[PDB]
Amino acid sequence: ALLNIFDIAGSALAAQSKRLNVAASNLANADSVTGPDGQPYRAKQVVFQVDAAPGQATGGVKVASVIESQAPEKLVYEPGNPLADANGYVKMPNVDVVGEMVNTMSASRSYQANIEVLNTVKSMMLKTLTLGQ
Amino acid sequence: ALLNIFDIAGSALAAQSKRLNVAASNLANADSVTGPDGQPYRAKQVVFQVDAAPGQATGGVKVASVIESQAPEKLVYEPGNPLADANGYVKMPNVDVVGEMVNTMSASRSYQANIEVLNTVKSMMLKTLTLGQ
Amino acid sequence: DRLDAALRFQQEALNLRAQRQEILAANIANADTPGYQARDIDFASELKKVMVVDLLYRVPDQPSLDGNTVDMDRERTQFADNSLKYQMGLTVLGSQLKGMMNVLQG
Amino acid sequence: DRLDAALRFQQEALNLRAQRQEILAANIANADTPGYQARDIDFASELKKVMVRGRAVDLLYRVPDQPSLDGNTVDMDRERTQFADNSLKYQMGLTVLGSQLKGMMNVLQG
Amino acid sequence: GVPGALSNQPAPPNEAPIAT
Amino acid sequence: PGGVPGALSNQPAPPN
Amino acid sequence: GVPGALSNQPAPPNEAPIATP
Amino acid sequence: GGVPGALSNQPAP
Amino acid sequence: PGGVPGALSNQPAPPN
Amino acid sequence: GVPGALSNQPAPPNEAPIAT
Amino acid sequence: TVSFAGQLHAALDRISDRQAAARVQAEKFTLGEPGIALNDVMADMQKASVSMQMGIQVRNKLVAAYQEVMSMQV
Amino acid sequence: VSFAGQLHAALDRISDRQAAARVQAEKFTLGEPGIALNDVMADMQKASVSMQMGIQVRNKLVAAYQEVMSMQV
Amino acid sequence: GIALNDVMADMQKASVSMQMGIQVRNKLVAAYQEVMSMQV
């Protein structure tokens, strides 16, 4: 379907968009006490894999799944909350602020770099077709 | 012997396309952490050789092989990510973004130059075919 | 006519590229409609069918709240690719017609 | 004459496209004129009338999209889109008419 | 009719009064 | 026919 | 399967409840 | 060979 | 003997 | 030799060391 | 029972119906009727042009052959 | 082996080259992997050049035949 | 192999030589027929 460069750069754009979405969702839920069921929000992470279609030669980036972080959930002593345990510590998400801003900046700069790569390739693509005519 | 220019410039175009593809693959995976085998993505680069069989004076260019770039793997301290080292040193690819962008630009320019060579050569072949007429 | 048989493949490819271009632009235009599904066609299978259309839903990537499954990046890349392939088909068809012409000119 | 009849359609369509381009340019030039209702012509019906009767178009008002306090009907997005489409169709008419004339000329070429 | 169609009759004048 | 274009004809005015 | 593939089935509606039903 | 060109159709068929 | 074109062979290489 | 001229002997391999 | 005049009439008909079909397709596309595509219009016009060039070249060859035969002396 | 045989061989070679270029172009338009646009465009270029060569050879050959048949005996 | 440069040049040279032969033979044949159309 897609040309190889198109597929690689578009996969890069989609992967960076997914990472930015995960960062934004984490930054929104930084102060959430409960979900829809009664469990604390867990910071999400996105794992980049190389989609090496040929044997070890090249390939874009794919995202296998969005994993839930395994870090000590923040404990805040609020015994009056219905979600407090026997000891009374309500669970707050493990979303760090600085890491998510850094992730947003890095995802934006990778997105823009891949956009520039596509823009650069495009002129050569259109100029290839003048070879025959 | 203007026909050999077709082969020379076509080989050059194919080699520059392969180089641009490899550079774009490296750039799109600068943020990757995992490969299909779990290994960290290693930045790769093509090798250019003169496409001359033994006894041939000058030919085009050919891609001998794709080799892993020689650079230290970028160590990141994240001993919370499921992928880690003994001391929590996540290994990230050694992609130098500026180098890859410059490589993409250079490949595009060389590609366009070879296209111009092919165009003017075809024009000359037609004019030669209109020798006496 | 034998002239049709020679130019049938490129004409059908060009028409299919134009139709898929229209479908992709419709996907772009209706990006903000809540509940709109992103539709597309499988170019190779439909080209087989015409040489010898049905719309297939695009697999959503991110779940939106309004039910819109149109992704900007994917369809922008597909739109650019379809434009490039339409230009390539125009080039090939024009080259074939120009060759058939210079065969006759004299 | 038959040479007129065979070439009449594309010439009349080209003239109508030129007139409608003039009307669209008048609509765009009047984009800030208060109390100006955007005008246009229906190309298909006018061309059918031109062919059937023989060679004063009916200027139909464009329905407004959104109300403006100054009474200006000209919607610039629709006007730009129709201007681009009209220009493209005018190029098409030029190309087809030139193809017909060049086919006749190549027939006459001995 | 359609917001961007063609009609034979001018659109009615639009006025914005302060109070009705 | 027409009038001032822009600012003076795009604000609510008293009847007159 | 892969995001961006082609399927003959529309995706299920995207509901996001605020409380558990 | 091992590396497909940038201007080639997606290796993934 | 050719080599890697572009960035790798135009940056100052290590001594050995 | 004048740059752009033609000579039958190849140019020597050039190197840019970091430390002498 | 073959007929050279009949064959020429059939060939001229083939060319004329091809040209008329392309012309009518352009007619409908200019009139704004849905279902007609610009690339198809251009391709059909170019096909008609190729067919007419075929006819012109065959005419040239036939006329040259006839003139050379009739310019002979018995 | 003979002049007619050589002309038939040249026509077959030119047609085979043109058909190969066309088949590769159709394969690329099909979406099958491994076919690069560079090779398609270069092969179409080569096929066009070969067609033009055949046209020129035909033109001259016809001119020479007309010249020979014009000889007065 | 042989390039268009050589193919076209030899093709033209052969055309020129064939035309020269045709013209010289035509002159010889015309002279012979003029001699034989005599009246003695």
| K23 close to D99: Cβ distance less than 8 angstroms | no
Q: How far is L28 from chain A (nearest CA, A)?
A: 10
Q: What is the C-alpha separation between B60 and B45, in angstroms, rounded? A: 19
Experimental resolution (Å): 3.3
DSSP structure string for D29-71:
HTTT-TTPPPEE--HHHHHHHHHHH------EEEPPSS--TT-
CA angle A28, A31, A36 (to 5 degrees): 80
Encoded tokens for M22:
């045709």
Three-state secondary-structure class, residue B60: strand
Can you tell me which residue has the tokens 């496209």? Answer: D17
CA-to-CA distance for M32 and K6, rounded, in angstroms? Answer: 49
Helices (H), M1-40: 4-36
Separation CA B117–CA B111 (nearest Å): 10
Rounded Cα gap, residues B15 and B20, in angstroms: 9
Of A127, A2, A21, A130, nearest to C76 by C-alpha is: A2
User: Which pair of tokens denotes residue L2?
Assistant: 């003979």
H5: burial class by Cβ within 10 Å (0-12, 13-18, 19+)?
Answer: buried
Residue L45 backbone zone (phi > 0: left; psi -120 to 50: alpha; other: beta): alpha
By C-alpha distance, which of B31, B41, B22 is closest to B107?
B22
DSSP string of B64-94, one letter each residue: EEEEE--S--EEEE-TTSSS--TTSEEEE--
Q: Cα distance from F12 to chain E (closest Cα, Å)?
A: 6
Token code pair at residue A98: 């600085």
CB L52 within 8 A of CB B126: yes
Strand partners, B49: B62
Beta-bridge partners for D40: D60
A112, amino acid identity: Q
Contacts of L55 (CB under 8 A, 6+ apart): C102, C103
CA A76, A81, A85, A90 torsion-angle sign: negative
The chain F residue lying nearest D67, using CA atoms, is F10
CA D38, CA D73: separation in Å to the nearest integer? Answer: 5
User: Rounded to an integer, what is the distance from CA C70 to the centroid of its chain?
Assistant: 18
Cα of E8 vs its chain's centroid, Å: 13
Alpha-carbon gap: H6 to the closest alpha carbon of chain B (Å): 5
C-alpha neighbours within 13 Å on the C-beta side of residue C78: 28
* DSSP 8-state class, residue B42: P
Interface of D with K (CB under 8 A): 9-10, 13, 43-44, 47-48, 89, 92-93, 95-96, 99, 103, 106-107
The pair phi, psi for residue E18, each rounded to 5°, is -65, -45
- Tell me if C60 sits within 8 A of G3, measured CB to CB: yes
Contacting residues for K35 by C-beta, under 8 A, at least 6 apart = none
What CA–CA distance (Å, rounded) separates C36 from C68?
Answer: 5
Phi-psi group of K10: left, alpha or beta (phi > 0 → left; psi -120 to 50 → alpha; rest → beta): alpha
Quickly count: other Cβ atoms within 10 Å of residue E8's Cβ.
Answer: 9
Nearest CA in chain E to D62: E6
Structure tokens at A44: 């999400």
Quick check: B130 and B28 in contact, CB under 8 A? no
A88 Cβ contact list (under 8 Å, min separation 6): A77, A78, A79
Paired residues of A66 in beta bridges: A46
**Which residues make Cβ contacts (< 8 Å) with residue B120, sequence separation at least 6?**
none
Q: How was this structure determined?
A: cryo-EM
Those residues whose C-beta lies under 8 Å from the C-beta of residue B86, and which sit 6 or more positions away, are none
CA distance B110 to B20: 10
C-alpha to C-alpha distance for A52 and B36, rounded to whole angstroms: 7
Contact by Cβ (8 Å): A108, B96: no
Q: Is L30 on the interface with A (CB under 8 A)?
A: no
> Two tokens at I15?
């001594």
CA proximity to D26, closest of D13, D14, D41:
D41
Nearest Cα to Cα of residue B129 among L5, E17, L55: L55
Query: d(Cα D58, Cα L29) in Å, to the nearest integer?
Result: 48
* Range A66-72 contact pairs with CB under 8 angstroms and sequence separation of 24 or more: A66/A18, A66/A22, A67/B82, A68/A42, A68/A43, A68/A44, A69/A42, A69/A43, A69/A44, A69/A45, A69/A94, A69/B80, A70/B80, A70/B82, A71/A43, A71/B80
Contact C15, K40 (CB under 8 A): yes
DSSP 8-state assignment for residue C41: -
Bridge partner residues of B51 (DSSP): B60
Tokens of K58: 């065959």
The reply to whether residue B13 touches residue L38, judged by beta carbons under 8 angstroms, is yes
Q: Do D69 and F4 touch (CB under 8 A)?
A: no
Using alpha carbons only, give the angle B124, B130, C3 rounded to the nearest 5 degrees: 95
Q: Is the dihedral of CA D18, D20, D26, D30 positive or negative?
A: negative
Closest approach of D10 to chain F, Cα-based (Å): 38
Strand, helix or coil for residue E7: strand
Contact residues, B window 68-107, toward A, CB-based 8 Å cutoff: 80-83, 97, 101, 104-105
| CA–CA gap between residue B55 and residue D92 (Å, rounded) | 57
Residue of chain H whose Cα is closest to the Cα of A3? H9
| CA C75 to each of CA A130, C34, D6, G9, M24: distance values in angstroms, whole numbers, following the listed order | 26, 17, 45, 19, 74
Taking each helix axis as running N to C, give the angle between helix C72-104 and helix A4-28, from 0 to 180 degrees, rounded to the nearest 10: 160
Note whether G touches A: 3 CB pairs or more under 8 A. Answer: yes
Reported as type and span, the H/E element at residue M39 is none
Query: Across the beta sheet with E6-7, what order do the strands follow?
Result: D39-40, D60-62, E6-7
CA I8 to chain centre: 4
From CA K9, how far away is CA K30, in angstroms rounded? 31
For chain J, after which residues does the C atom lie more than 2.5 Å from the next written residue's N, i.e. where is it broken? none
Tokens representing M31 are 């002279």
Give the Cα separation of C20 and C10 in Å (integer). Answer: 15
Contact between A8 and B25 under an 8 Å Cβ cutoff? The reply is: yes
Four-point Cα dihedral C61, C66, C67, C70, nearest 10:
-50
**CB within 8 Å of C63: residues ≥ 6 apart:** G14
Report the neighbours of I using a cutoff of 3 or more CB pairs below 8 angstroms: B, J
J15 Cβ contact list (under 8 Å, min separation 6): none
**Beta strand pairing call for C39-40 and C56-58:** antiparallel
Query: Which tokens belong to C106?
Result: 């004299």
Strand order in the sheet with G6-7: C39-40, C56-58, G6-7
Give the Cα separation of B132 and C18 in Å (integer): 44
* Count helices and strands in chain A by DSSP H and E runs: 2, 4
Pairing of strands D60-62, A74-77: unpaired
- Give the containing element (helix H, strand E) for C78: helix C72-104
Cα atoms in the Cβ-side hemisphere of radius 13 Å centred on A15: 29
L37/H8 CB distance under 8 A:
yes
Cβ burial of B46 (10 Å; 0-12, 13-18, 19+) is: buried
Beta bridge partners of B1: none
Query: CB of B21 within 8 A of CB of B104?
Result: no
Question: Quick one: DSSP state of residue B43?
Answer: P
Residue C12: what are its φ and ψ, rounded to 5°?
-65, -40
**Plot region of L31 (φ>0 → left; ψ -120 to 50 → alpha; else → beta):** left
Residues B13 and B115: their CA atoms lie apart, in Å, by 8
Q: Which residue has the tokens 């030139």?
A: D98
Q: Are B27 and B95 in contact (CB under 8 A)?
A: yes
- Using alpha carbons, select from A12, L68, A122, C77 the residue that is nearest to residue B25: A12
Q: Which two tokens stand for residue C88?
A: 């390539």
Q: Exposure pattern of C26-48 as b/e (b: 16+ CB <10 Å)?
A: ebeeeeeeeebbbbbbbbeebbe
Return d(Cα D96, Cα A115) in angstroms, integer: 40
In angstroms, the CA A15 to CA D54 distance is 63
